[PDB]
Amino acid sequence: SLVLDQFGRNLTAAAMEGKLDPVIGREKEIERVMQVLSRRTKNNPVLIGEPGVGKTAVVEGLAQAIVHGEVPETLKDKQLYTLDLGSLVAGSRYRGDFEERLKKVLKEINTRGDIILFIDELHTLVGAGAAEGAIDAASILKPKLARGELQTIGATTLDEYRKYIEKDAALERRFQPVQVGEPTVEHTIEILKGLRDRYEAHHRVSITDAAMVAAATLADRYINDRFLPDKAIDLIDEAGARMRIRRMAEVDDEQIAEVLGNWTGIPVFKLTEAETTRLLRMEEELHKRIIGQEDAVKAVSKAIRRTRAGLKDPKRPSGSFIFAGPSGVGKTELSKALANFLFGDDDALIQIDMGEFHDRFTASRLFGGQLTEKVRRKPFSVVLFDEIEKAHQEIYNSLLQVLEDGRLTDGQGRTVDFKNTVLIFTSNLGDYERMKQKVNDELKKHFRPEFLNRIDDIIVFHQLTREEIIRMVDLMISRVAGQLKSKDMALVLTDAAKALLAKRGFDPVLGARPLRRTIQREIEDQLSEKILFEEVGPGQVVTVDVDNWDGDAVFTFT
Amino acid sequence: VLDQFGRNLTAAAMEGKLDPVIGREKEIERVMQVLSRRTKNNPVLIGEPGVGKTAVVEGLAQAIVHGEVPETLKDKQLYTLDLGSLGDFEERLKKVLKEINTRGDIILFIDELHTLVDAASILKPKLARGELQTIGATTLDEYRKYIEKDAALERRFQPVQVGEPTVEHTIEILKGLRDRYEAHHRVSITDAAMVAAATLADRYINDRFLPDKAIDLIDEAGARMRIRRMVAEVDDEQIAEVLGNWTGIPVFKLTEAETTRLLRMEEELHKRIIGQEDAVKAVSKAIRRTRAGLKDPKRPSGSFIFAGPSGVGKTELSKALANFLFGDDDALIQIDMGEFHDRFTASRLQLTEKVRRKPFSVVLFDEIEKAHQEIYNSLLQVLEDGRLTDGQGRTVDFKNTVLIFTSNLGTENDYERMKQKVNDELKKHFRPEFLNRIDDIIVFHQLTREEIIRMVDLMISRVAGQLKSKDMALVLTDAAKALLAKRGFDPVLGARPLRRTIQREIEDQLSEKILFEEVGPGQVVTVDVDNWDGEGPGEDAVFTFT
């Protein structure tokens, strides 16, 4: 009463006043908690669930049930109070100040006799004040909780409850777990529709139903750091705040798209649900960053189109393709373009090389895992598994069981979800039909036939045309000039210079992979030492020309 | 009543006492985002120290006074509360918060919000009641230590980040504060002096942080200009002498144009290291072409490969580079991957703390051949993005560190085929892509006889100086020098056995001889070799002392 207000807020008084957001569709959990509160002894329920699902919202709905009057006789006229243990632990720089405040609180509850306590952060009840063996909050609340005199409600998390409270059997037998469900998409839509009036009053903006649908279907499908529905309500509230500061109107999909793109860094035009427009123009979107391989681009575009269609059974990974051919043809930047188009991030792709990890000890590092950690952070990521030749049998067993099941069984005891990830196997093993037959019967004589039958599409990359090599050289001098424009370097590459760069930078036995080693050693070091020794300066065009070979050669940086 | 228990900000801008802010529009707009919300409407300002956590608050106050804020912040007054002005304290704080609730349009600024977490007995519930609109200002590490682990606080506080401004942004901040500081100190400041101050602040100062690290320099320079005067212009020389007084660094030509400092490497390194002048000029031209900013500025400033025997000059080259580039040998950090051969030691990548101690420091990653695979992955990540994801959770900047990989792999036409086998073995024993991200690969050369004797003379210079400390005299002949070089000749392992040969032959015998007390004080000691012709192995040759 006069001391409880200094540590918490009267939910019941605000419920009469009417400052509580209403809850819809959580009647089962409210009824279960009301069932537990109706017990004679051990009437303390603990709400078990992930943060951000609505446990405090469930308790507020219970308070709304208290004020309106749909509760039994033993919950009638019971003032609900909330307490935080952080406001009691803090200030205990002396022997027993925390215990003094807690005892004053309990004495006030005993005098009032009609208070149900909400003490969130229930996990610190064992550790508050002194250590776990000495006199703590648990050690003083235990002989009062078990006799059904102090009605308290907790709120914790699965792992939190399991490895704090379940260790203490005496506390476990005093708290009844009431599991709180993670709401579905329709539940979030219904809650947003219910809170439409409150946020219209607060923000003075009009909110549309399509905005709610888009907010929910992007919150659950880009954001994975937490769970529904705090993310969606935060999104719509921040969009309303954005309009409220930009006005000095009507909420549509553009505003929620731009605020979530601000959240994630993904560009706004990709967030709106014009996915058919994405798949219509995806070929030139992929081709502006890839070079050549027109048949490969067409094959992968049709494959991605049929896999995104969803007409297949929803028990399969979204993508599983074999990339074969000589090294350096462009499979890596092809995967990079895939990561850019499908998810809007170049770093959303996970790049692991499997040839270095041989034994089961490194297989523990693989799964049990960094791949597991990244697909738990964000399951909607393309995965790269290079060098499938050198793996050992347990790795093939794990890969094929992931393929056939869509699930991965790690050493951390979580079956991660791979229903939307894209599996890319860039293996250098092994005219187009002859190559398909060669890779097919080579895989049959090396792998199991089920691996070949399980894969979706096999894509073969041909050799790069010399003109396409010149095109890649032009592409790289574009970025070289872009990074050199700070000193006004306008570089001009003559055709003979292009031919010599293509000759020195491309090794047919090694593919195009040594390009990055060749290009800086043959161009950037020379221009850098010419800049340092003042042969050329800023504000002048550098036209490089090469002699002694027009179709040991010396280059001139004119 | 808050006037005697706190300091106003919106009413402080009436007199113009608050300093102007420059270029903080994005952070102020994010604060505008957060303050105009119904849930999580109290922003907390996360920033590394000395950046302007308060400066955005005076910027918001100036925006409120000038009138570029939405309707919810009309007629909002900002108050900073002081705990010094606050039984009686509890009721005073209670009546202050009740007056805030009664007024209804007072927004509070509290710095170091983790200190609230003996005022927690008052604010914690009535903040939960929602009648305070508040902006917090806390460093990220106390945020993670106190607020993030307290689950009852994230329902009302939302994080916003205040990063380090760029150097041009700091120049603009100095340009903004020019009028105030010129008014107060009645001294004149040059724009070139300001840009030099920003650059040298980023260069020679580590403990303090931008942009306070430049503004304190400018105030200090103006103060010392006042001291030297009692037609005043603060210039680059003033900033250089401020840094010389501050960091204890000299000021003659080292706080100057960097091109002259980078073009003189050969003589100053040759002052310490011995020979290998081809590798010296190769690594000198490599660091010249890499550190000049001509590379992409989002990558490490250097990546070096010194293949060769251990302790035969590559470690000496590293020590000389540390002594030249930054003036100190202690910034050179010694990491060898021989000790980091297990995953538990590999996840330690003692590494973050000492490189955060001095970001402008060289690094040594020794024996990369026996490094772990997770070490390979981390080095590949560092080479690719130029950053690092530590266990603490901050990106350690590598715009400034140069990478040195000292390895014993592979150990002029003979040296040509040695370089051929070095590149072949980095192609096969290592992956090609790891060495593809390396600026240059240079291989050391085996020592010649003159190189060995100029090891020998400076090796014996230590004991010669010790003898001069006792007023002795040491003289060596050329025949004894040649024999002593031949005894220590071990090309497989290098110059380390030369230390042992010197120790067993010269120093030990002379330490016994000075105790024998016949060639002690007042006589020059001259070593000589007899019973030796000049070609023999030296088995019949005995050192003699005169």
Ligand SMILES: Nc1ncnc2c1ncn2[C@@H]1O[C@H](COP(=O)(O)OP(=O)(O)O)[C@@H](O)[C@H]1O
């Ligand atoms: N069914 C619901 N009805 C009303 N509000 C809800 C519902 N589910 C979630 N919320 C909102 O989600 C936010 C987080 O819920 P809350 O239980 O208070 O904290 P947490 O779920 O993070 O423990 C609250 O602001 C609440 O208003």
Ligand SMILES: Nc1ncnc2c1ncn2[C@@H]1O[C@H](COP(=O)(O)OP(=O)(O)O)[C@@H](O)[C@H]1O
């Ligand atoms: N953009 C800016 N414009 C003007 N002044 C600035 C700017 N950024 C920082 N400052 C000045 O630099 C000083 C640094 O303040 P700081 O110590 O970071 O505050 P806090 O202690 O709250 O973190 C401030 O007093 C401010 O006047």
